[PDB]
């Protein structure tokens, strides 16, 4: 576990076995854990992608670390995922876990599918970022962003370092997940991967204005 160090606003990284006599740590107030989102890294942030990048395995214990600071998310998820018979898919979040409150859009998703036994984890190990908490598991009805966690030493300086989109899922990734974006309980639009949170809002407002069970964008 490397530690970033900020010197004259320049990142340096201090390795565990490398002695740096210029790293001045007067107190632990200079030590921070920072959550960053998988957004500024240039990847897709839509709902179909989120499904594809997630998977399950049983027998894998839960793991949690915290953080004090982090990035704002353009795209968060809040999932209330059920088995076809109504049984819960996702585990309950443990006490003290709160959904992440710093999202411009929240991809609130429900619907049904087979939900293979196990916990839902990220395919490349990204953390699910909950309010001030990072963990390896997706929890039920809890808002989170997806990202990574850095640790670092700050210099002693005075720098100080919404919209809900409702979707319905189709089988959680069984070689197809046709998501529909819900405009109303009686109005659904085919979700196309190039339709951003912003376009989904525009589509919702436009069809509502025009009187609305399934519709397509037809661009």
């Amino acid at each position: 576990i490397p530690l970033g160090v900020v010197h004259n606003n320049t990142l340096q990284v201090s390795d565990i076995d490398k002695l740096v006599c210029r790293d001045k740590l007067s107190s632990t107030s200079q030590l921070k854990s920072v959550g960053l989102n998988l957004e500024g890294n240039g990847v897709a942030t839509d709902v179909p992608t989120a499904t594809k990048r997630w998977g399950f395995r049983a027998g894998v214990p839960p793991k949690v670390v915290n953080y004090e600071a982090g990035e704002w998310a353009e795209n968060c998820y809040n999932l209330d995922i059920k088995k076809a018979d109504g049984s819960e898919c996702l585990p309950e979040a443990p006490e003290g876990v709160r959904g992440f409150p710093r999202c411009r859009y929240v991809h609130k998703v429900s619907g049904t599918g087979p939900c293979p036994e196990g916990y839902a984890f990220h395919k490349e190990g990204a953390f699910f970022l909950y309010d001030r908490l990072a963990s390896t598991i997706i929890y039920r009805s809890t808002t989170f962003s997806e990202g990574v966690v850095a640790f670092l030493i700050l210099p002693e300086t005075k720098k100080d370092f919404t919209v809900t989109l409702n979707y319905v899922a189709d089988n959680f990734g069984t070689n197809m997940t046709n998501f529909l974006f819900q405009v109303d309980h009686l109005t659904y639009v085919q979700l196309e991967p190039r339709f951003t949170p912003q376009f989904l809002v525009q589509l919702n407002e436009t069809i509502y204005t025009n009187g609305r069970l399934i519709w397509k964008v037809n661009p």
Epitope: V168, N171, L186, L213, N218
Partner: antibody, heavy 140, light 108 residues
Framework: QVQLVQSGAEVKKPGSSVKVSCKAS????????ISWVRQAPGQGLEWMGG????????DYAQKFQGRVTITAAKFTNIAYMELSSLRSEDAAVYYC?????????????????????????????????WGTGTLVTVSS | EIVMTQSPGTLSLSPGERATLSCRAS???????LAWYQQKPGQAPRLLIY???SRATGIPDRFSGSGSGPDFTLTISRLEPEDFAVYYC?????????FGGGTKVEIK
């Protein structure tokens, strides 16, 4: 093995609304398309819209627009057809059946796009499980 | 909706006799998805054939379908007393799917 069970025969007056119920009976109806028919005497099977309890959308038949509600409670085992404005033409044996026990894109078919206008899409598959039927006698 | 008819509409047959039933759609059926099913009065219908010719689950070899486009048939070999049913067709190759009026098989 699931065997769908329909309610028994009943006698109804014209103008009434008959809520026809079917039990999954060895299964549930959760996300499955439950199709219905009306076997009026001397006729074949008149098709009615499929019901999904845990629905996105459900279908409807054209001949029953404004006449039949297609509905079930989420994650239930009872499915219903609400036959409003009952007429003697509705004296029939009604049946419930399972066909496409997973509404998904293969189950989403319909008229093609007309840019500026949109179409809903729904489709059901081969009905493998048919339940018992209910004779609804309609007075006139 | 979609129009479908059936023919001859009546078949007076001896038990053990081989006979062919026909169904006609007003339109071609995509992927030849025509179903055949049968019921005797008082019974719920049971799927015999799906996909024009393929046998449905639990269906004996005596039932074999065929056809293409709008034109389909069902051949029943060794007709048993249990098979003197009214046979019906349904189109799953279009939407909304549709049903024919039935073909009656009866004992001679």
């Amino acid at each position: 093995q699931v065997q769908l069970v329909q309610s028994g025969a009943e006698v109804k007056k014209p103008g009434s609304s008959v809520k026809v119920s079917c039990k999954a009976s060895g299964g549930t109806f959760d996300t499955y398309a439950i199709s219905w028919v009306r076997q009026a005497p001397g006729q074949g099977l008149e098709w009615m819209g499929g019901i999904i309890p845990v629905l996105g959308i459900v279908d409807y038949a054209q001949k029953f627009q404004g006449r039949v509600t297609i509905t079930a409670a989420k994650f239930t085992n009872i499915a219903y057809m609400e036959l409003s404005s009952l007429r003697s033409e509705d004296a029939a044996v009604y049946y419930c059946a399972r066909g496409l026990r997973s509404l998904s894109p293969r189950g989403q078919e319909g008229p093609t796009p007309a840019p500026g206008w949109r179409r809903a899409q729904y489709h059901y598959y081969y009905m493998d499980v048919w339940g018992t039927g209910t004779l609804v006698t309609v007075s006139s | 909706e979609i129009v479908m008819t059936q023919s001859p509409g009546t078949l007076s047959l001896s038990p053990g006799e081989r006979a062919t039933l026909s169904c006609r759609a007003s339109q071609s059926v995509s992927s030849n998805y025509l179903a055949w099913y049968q019921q005797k009065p008082g019974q719920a219908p049971r799927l015999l054939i799906y996909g024009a010719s393929s046998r449905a689950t639990g269906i004996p070899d005596r039932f074999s379908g065929s056809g293409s486009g709008p034109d389909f048939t069902l051949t029943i070999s060794r007709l048993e007393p249990e098979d003197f049913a009214v046979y019906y067709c349904q189109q799953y190759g279009s939407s909304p799917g549709t049903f024919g009026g039935g073909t009656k098989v009866e004992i001679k």
